[PDB]
Design a protein around this ligand. Structure first.
Ligand SMILES: [Mg+2]
Ligand SMILES: [Mg+2]
Ligand SMILES: [Mg+2]
Ligand SMILES: [Mg+2]
Ligand SMILES: [Mg+2]
Ligand SMILES: [Mg+2]
Ligand SMILES: [Mg+2]
Ligand SMILES: [Mg+2]
Ligand SMILES: [Mg+2]
Ligand SMILES: [Mg+2]
Ligand SMILES: [Mg+2]
Ligand SMILES: [Mg+2]
Ligand SMILES: [Mg+2]
Ligand SMILES: [Mg+2]
Ligand SMILES: [Mg+2]
Ligand SMILES: [Mg+2]
Ligand SMILES: [Mg+2]
Ligand SMILES: [Mg+2]
Ligand SMILES: [Mg+2]
Ligand SMILES: [Mg+2]
Ligand SMILES: [Mg+2]
Ligand SMILES: [Mg+2]
Ligand SMILES: [Mg+2]
Lengths: 50, 80, 50, 107, 155
RNA sequence: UAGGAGGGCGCGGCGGCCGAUGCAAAACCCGGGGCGCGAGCCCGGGCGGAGCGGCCGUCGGUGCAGAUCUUGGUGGUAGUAGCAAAUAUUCAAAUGAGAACUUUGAAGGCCGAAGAGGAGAAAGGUUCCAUGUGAACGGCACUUGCACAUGGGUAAGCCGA
RNA sequence: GGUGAACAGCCUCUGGCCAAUGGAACAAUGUAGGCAAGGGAAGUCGGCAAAACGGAUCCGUAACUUCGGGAAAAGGAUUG
RNA sequence: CGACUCUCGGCAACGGAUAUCUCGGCUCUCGCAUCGAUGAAGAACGUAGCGAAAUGCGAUACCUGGUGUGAAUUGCAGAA
């Protein structure tokens, strides 16, 4: 909706930031296991359910 | 008909985010959260699903205050 | 109200009008329009933007 | 070799029996194949005026005989598959019509 | 990095490889089986002439359903063949890369020939297609490794 | 055959005994040589690169070809079925490694205004806009994209709550 | 916008598109659409499917009837 | 001779079984008793020079302060 409540706007703000590739310098960091962001979300595939 | 023709009319939200638990389980028409039991005084919890109990028992969150209680027991609640 | 009151205490200026929106990223962004006694270029050079 | 020649393409026979939604596209394909048989040139460019002419009467009724002029000329592009290609353009018709008019060679 | 078959003479043979090429394994196999033991120049003529849809690659092993042509009578009498253009265009690239390798080594690129050509399966890639009655089935590719060695022919 | 018993073979521990091992252990592969009727065992060669075996006592989550067995992989089917509604595309030029699919122009057409137009409610949540692109995706293709990456954008005393 | 009783169908203007993978061929069997000599339901469980009638003006309009209908009965003529 | 099929070996693939491990599990045993209206458990949102998660923290926000140890952090830069 274009008329979204502030709660939903605030909580859709965070799921914006939650969707970015890992910083490249995470991969070179010692004793690391992070291979990619295994929690990405695409808007056509996974609906946030709210 | 039932099925494909009828799944197109899912348009209105029966459940929305509860404020006590943040789950999408707040039945608006009935005004009660369907997981934490809000707005009941006590949290909805049942012994017929220990799996559901462990998902929200103590220790799954920050424990912003109880994490320090063992340290304060050690040395027996001292303040100078 | 607080945005004007604060832009007055800093910068030794005053705002003729202020508009606020909440960006999608979460932060609030405010447009502060100055009275024509004060020049935005001079203020922005005295803070350093351009 | 440079050479320009005026042809009369009996385009009714070549397009007999074709599907309506394809008679004009196959008219274009037959103009290309006629230029290819005419001067053995792989690269044939049909001028936009010839396309406009063929496509003037819709997609399902095309001109029946078309008086075209095909010009075999050099490809001066430094990169080129063939040294020489053919440019087919629509040709002026004398007021006499197409009666008694065979293939000509334009100076 | 070592090929299935070692060259007859290692210093006077060039070699080229590709892994996980997104082309049909069966089509490229049928290409390679026509290109084995050919001269390099004749292989380039032949294969570019295949991609030009003027000479046909016989299909023998993976052939059931392949329609017939007259273009392949000289080498498969019942005339069952196709013109796999993507396969041909991928194999051309390795033939050129091995020509380049042989040029760098210093061989007679006029006297090179297909001493050993091998296509082999690779890790399949997964896609999904949707069928009647709410069922899905996998829709997967068959990428291949293509592995070839040119050697200089000798009397 | 159903069944019962005896003697053995084999897997993994524990208490003991005898050993092997970076001059190559375990595992696995072999048109290699043998032993036993047989379960199985011993040796040879290769890969392997750090552990392992034998004997006595004893213990056990101990032996697979089936259970429309469970998990994972792979085949034949098979380059086969197929990709067919919504009339329709055609020509130059530009870009590009590469053009039936991109962009410009030209021509032919369709929607025909209870539309394939212009905007909204719910719903979605950044899909909007720009620049770039290795892969993946867009059931052909792509220089392209609702894809991937980096940035930007939503201003209210009067429109709503 | 035109025809038309008409927000029917058909065609065009503003706006939007040519997006549904393409090349060659026109074999059988298909899916969708047609047309057929003479006959006219003989086909088949069955006129299933298709064809036929169809707008308008003028005339005419039966049995039965709850006296309201049947009725756009049926049957004819005309149309640029 | 050759293609196709069956088959044997060598080599190459696909696949990840086995072999050796293991900051994890399970099981048993022991010591203690310490949440919350002085706002708990849970949830949400923020927070780092370069961070999305997890770990941490709360507009003093991957930390402030005392004490202890005594020369680092670390993927890059930097002030030191
Ligand atoms: Mg309803
Ligand atoms: Mg309801
Ligand atoms: Mg506002
Ligand atoms: Mg479905
Ligand atoms: Mg068992
Ligand atoms: Mg077993
Ligand atoms: Mg088994
Ligand atoms: Mg059995
Ligand atoms: Mg087929
Ligand atoms: Mg179909
Ligand atoms: Mg209306
Ligand atoms: Mg619309
Ligand atoms: Mg866009
Ligand atoms: Mg594709
Ligand atoms: Mg009228
Ligand atoms: Mg109308
Ligand atoms: Mg008839
Ligand atoms: Mg009958
Ligand atoms: Mg009968
Ligand atoms: Mg009968
Ligand atoms: Mg009967
Ligand atoms: Mg009927
Ligand atoms: Mg009656």
């Amino acid at each position: 909706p274009s008329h979204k409540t502030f709660r939903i706007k605030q909580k859709l703000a965070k799921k914006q930031r939650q969707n970015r590739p890992i910083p490249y310098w995470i991969r070179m960091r010692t004793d690391n296991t992070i291979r990619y962001n295994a929690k990405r979300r695409h808007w056509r595939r996974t609906k946030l359910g709210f | 008909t039932k099925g494909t023709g009828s799944f197109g009319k899912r348009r209105n939200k029966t459940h929305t985010l509860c404020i006590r638990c943040g789950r999408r389980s707040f039945h608006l028409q009935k005004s009660t959260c369907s997981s934490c039991g809000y707005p009941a005084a006590r949290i909805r919890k049942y012994n017929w699903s220990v799996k559901a109990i462990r998902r929200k028992t103590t220790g799954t969150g920050r424990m912003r205050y109880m994490r320090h209680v063992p340290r304060r027991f050690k040395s027996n609640f001292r303040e100078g | 109200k607080k945005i004007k009151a604060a832009v007055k205490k800093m910068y030794d200026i005053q705002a003729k009008k202020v508009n606020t929106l909440i960006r999608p990223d979460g932060k609030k962004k405010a447009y502060v329009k100055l009275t024509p006694d004060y020049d935005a270029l001079d203020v922005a050079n005295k803070i350093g933007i351009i | 070799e440079v050479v320009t020649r005026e042809y009369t393409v009996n385009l009714h026979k070549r397009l007999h029996g074709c599907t309506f939604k394809k008679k004009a596209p196959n008219a274009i394909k037959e103009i290309r194949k006629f230029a290819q048989k005419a001067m053995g040139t792989n690269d044939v460019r049909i001028d936009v005026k010839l396309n406009k002419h063929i496509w003037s009467s819709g997609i399902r009724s095309v001109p029946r005989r078309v008086r075209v002029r095909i010009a075999r000329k050099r490809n001066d592009e430094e990169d080129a598959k063939e040294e020489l290609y053919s440019l087919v353009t629509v040709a002026e018709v004398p007021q006499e019509g197409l009666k008694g008019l065979g293939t000509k060679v334009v100076e | 990095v070592k090929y299935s078959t070692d060259p007859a003479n290692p210093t006077k043979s060039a070699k080229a490889m590709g892994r996980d090429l997104r082309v049909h394994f069966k089509n490229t196999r049928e290409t390679a089986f026509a290109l084995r033991k050919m001269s390099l120049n004749k292989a380039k003529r032949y294969l570019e002439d295949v991609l030009a849809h003027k000479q046909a690659i016989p299909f023998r092993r993976y052939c059931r359903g392949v329609g017939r042509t007259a273009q392949v009578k000289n080498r498969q009498p019942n005339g069952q063949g196709r013109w796999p253009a993507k396969s041909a265009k991928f194999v051309l690239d390795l033939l050129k890369n091995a020509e380049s390798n042989a040029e760098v080594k210093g061989l007679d690129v006029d006297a090179l020939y297909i001493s050993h050509i091998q296509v082999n399966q690779a890790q399949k890639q997964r896609r999904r297609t949707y069928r009647a009655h709410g069922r899905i089935n996998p829709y997967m590719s068959n990428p291949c490794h293509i592995e070839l060695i040119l050697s200089e022919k000798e009397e």
